[PDB]
Design an enzyme around this catalytic site. Structure first.
Site, PDB file in Angstrom:
ATOM      1  N   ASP A  35       0.838  -1.187   0.000  1.00  0.00           N
ATOM      2  CA  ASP A  35       0.000   0.000   0.000  1.00  0.00           C
ATOM      3  C   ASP A  35       0.874   1.239   0.000  1.00  0.00           C
ATOM      4  OD1 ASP A  35      -1.938   1.922   0.311  1.00  0.00           O
ATOM      5  OD2 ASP A  35      -2.414   1.431   2.395  1.00  0.00           O
ATOM      6  N   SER A 199      -0.523  15.504 -11.994  1.00  0.00           N
ATOM      7  CA  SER A 199      -0.785  15.134 -13.371  1.00  0.00           C
ATOM      8  C   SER A 199      -1.010  16.387 -14.209  1.00  0.00           C
ATOM      9  CB  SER A 199      -2.001  14.206 -13.444  1.00  0.00           C
ATOM     10  OG  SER A 199      -2.363  13.968 -14.792  1.00  0.00           O
TER      11      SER A 199
END
Ligand SMILES: O=C(O)[C@H](O)c1cccc(Cl)c1
Length: 330
Positions: A35, A199
């Site tokens: 994770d 992004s």
């Protein structure tokens, strides 16, 4: 040193991925959920409330000759999906794919929430975010990656998740056969303890690319792709009949649909998520309403590039002094 371990979807939807991890002496192999959005290595154990264990493989520290109680240390964690676990702490030898860390904090669960109990395939979590998020008190502990880092050939690990198929976590090296083209690197903020990056924008299907900064985290422990409501609305608007359902808990779409792809930007590069990756199947058994793999982050407080996005790429988690993330197509 290096390590290389196969990671395997837990079910037919890629709801999560499990990776075998050796703990203790002699080895006890548990299947952990790697994770990159948390920083605790915790396991079902011989200490876990019996009623809260249903099929999991447990760590039994009394059977490990290298286990040592970390006196006084406790841990307690809550995840973004509402699940939680807590317990005490041992140190022990932990190996992933041939890479061995001695004195790793292994957090033994005394309590786990129902969602963990109900998932017989996940024996615990191995956190790969920054150690600043580790919940051990009063002495915060290091992640497996942080402990291994100095010994690694290169201070990196990579996530190569499969779509409906196994993939790979590598530690200490970049497998140049595992991706196509080049790896595009992008800056990381560690200020919230996550692999947080920005992004450069998105496209829906064959649509024009929209240049827009989207700050979010690369999180292998999150199943779906959570993005701003504007972005997610633009995606689902291209699917006839798709709608957001408050009763179901997000966007649903007719199971008869052919989903469009979704592209996200990494600098000047582009990662394309095929439409099939965005299909998470009937909302309930036999239903003809299907659950979308792209959902709104509104209310979460952060955008999350979860498995739906990451499995479309070869992803480098570069833990050099100034950390960065790398994405390549594959
Ligand atoms: O199951 C149905 O009613 C159809 O598949 C359908 C129609 C419209 C929208 C959805 Cl989410 C599903």
């Amino acid at each position: 040193s290096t390590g290389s371990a196969t990671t395997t979807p837990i079910d037919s939807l890629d709801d999560a991925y499990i990776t075998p991890v050796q703990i203790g002496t002699p080895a006890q192999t548990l299947n952990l959920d790697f994770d990159t959005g948390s920083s605790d290595l915790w396991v079902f154990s011989s200490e876990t409330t019996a009623s809260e264990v249903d099929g999991q493989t447990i760590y039994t520290p009394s059977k490990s000759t290298t286990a040592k109680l970390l006196s006084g240390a406790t841990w307690s964690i809550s995840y973004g999906d509402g699940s939680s676990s807590s317990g005490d702490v041992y140190t022990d030898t932990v190996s992933v794919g041939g890479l061995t860390v001695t004195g790793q904090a292994v957090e033994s669960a005394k309590k786990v929430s129902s969602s963990f109990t109900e998932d017989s395939t996940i024996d615990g979590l191995l956190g790969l975010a920054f150690s600043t998020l580790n919940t051990v008190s009063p002495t915060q502990q290091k992640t497996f990656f942080d402990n291994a880092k100095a010994s690694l050939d290169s201070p990196v690990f990579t996530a190569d998740l499969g779509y409906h198929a196994p993939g790979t976590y590598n530690f200490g090296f970049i497998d140049t056969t595992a991706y196509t083209g080049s790896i595009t690197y992008t800056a990381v903020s560690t200020k919230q303890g996550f692999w947080e990056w920005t992004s450069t924008g998105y496209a829906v299907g064959s649509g024009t690319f929209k240049s827009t900064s989207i700050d979010g985290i690369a999180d292998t422990g999150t199943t779906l792709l959570y993005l701003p409501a504007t972005v997610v609305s633009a995606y689902w608007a291209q699917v006839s009949g798709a709608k957001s359902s408050s009763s179901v808990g997000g966007y649903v779409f007719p199971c008869s649909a052919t989903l469009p792809s979704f592209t996200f930007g990494v600098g000047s590069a582009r990662i394309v998520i095929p439409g099939d990756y965005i299909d998470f199947g009937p909302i309930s058994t036999g239903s003809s309403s299907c659950f979308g793999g792209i959902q709104s982050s509104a209310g979460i407080g952060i955008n999350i590039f979860g498995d739906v996005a990451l499995k479309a790429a070869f992803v480098v988690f570069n833990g050099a002094t100034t950390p960065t993330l790398g994405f390549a197509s594959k």
